[PDB]
Amino acid sequence: AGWNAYIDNLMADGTCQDAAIVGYKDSPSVWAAVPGKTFVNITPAEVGVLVGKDRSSFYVNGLTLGGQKCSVIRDSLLQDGEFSMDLRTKSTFNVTVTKTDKTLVLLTGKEGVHGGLINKKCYEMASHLRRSQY
Template sequence: MSWNSYIDSLTKSEWVDDAVILGCTQGQESVWAAAPGGWLSQVTPAEVKAIVASDRSGLFANGVTLAGRKCTVLRDTLNVEGQNTMDIKMKTSEKEPDPFSFTIGRSMQALIIAKGVKDAHGGKVNPLVFDMTAYLRKLNM
C-alpha cells in the first residue's frame, strides 16, 4: 500500500503545507510517507512514543515535540473512540516566530500529522485529518 496518496490528499488543501504518516504500533515508530521538503519527516520514534503513550497526565503541562520543535497541546482526544485526534500549536521562538497549528490523528496502525499554513487555525486543519483518520479506522488500518 502506498501512503503517498494520503499525503497528497492532505497537502492539496490550501490550509496544509506539510504532512507525515508514521507507524505508531510498538516497534514500528517510523516515517511511512512524508510531504517532499517538509520538516515533519524528521519526527522521531521517541516523539511518536510520547504522543501515543497511555499516560496522558503530562501532555497539557509539558506539551509534545515534533521534529524537535516544542508544541502546546490544545485538545487531546487521540484515544477517544470516534474522535482520535489531537490539536497542538507550535511554541514560538526567535528562530520560529510563527505558531503553526497541527492536528494529529491516530488510526489503528498510524499517526497522521498535518501542519497548517501560517495563520491557519486548528479548525481548518482538524477536519482533514479527522476525516482521513475515520476512513482508515473503518478499514482497520
C-alpha cells in the same frame, strides 16, 4: 505510490504546510510525508509520548514533533470515535494528530490557517484509513 497519494490529498490546497502518515506499532517509522518539512523527522520517542499513558505531562511542558516544540490545546487521541489531538507550535501554526489502528496522521496548516479545519481534514483522513482497516 500507495501512502504518498494520501499526502498529496492533504496538501492539495496551499493551506497545510506539512503532513505525514506514521506507523506506531512495534517499531515506529514514517510511512508517507511531505519532503523537506518537519514530520519527516519525527522520532519514535516523540511517538511514544503521543500514544503514551501519561497524558498530563505534555500539557504543562508540551511535546515535540520532528524536534518542533508544540503546545497542547486538545487531547482525545486515545478516545474511541474521536482519536485526535490538536496542537499549536511555540514560535505559530496549528497542528492536528489523529490515531488510526496502525498509523498516526499528522497535519499542520500554514500561518493564519484555523486549527479547526486542520482538525476536520486530519480527522477525515484517519476516518478513511480506519475503514480501510488501517
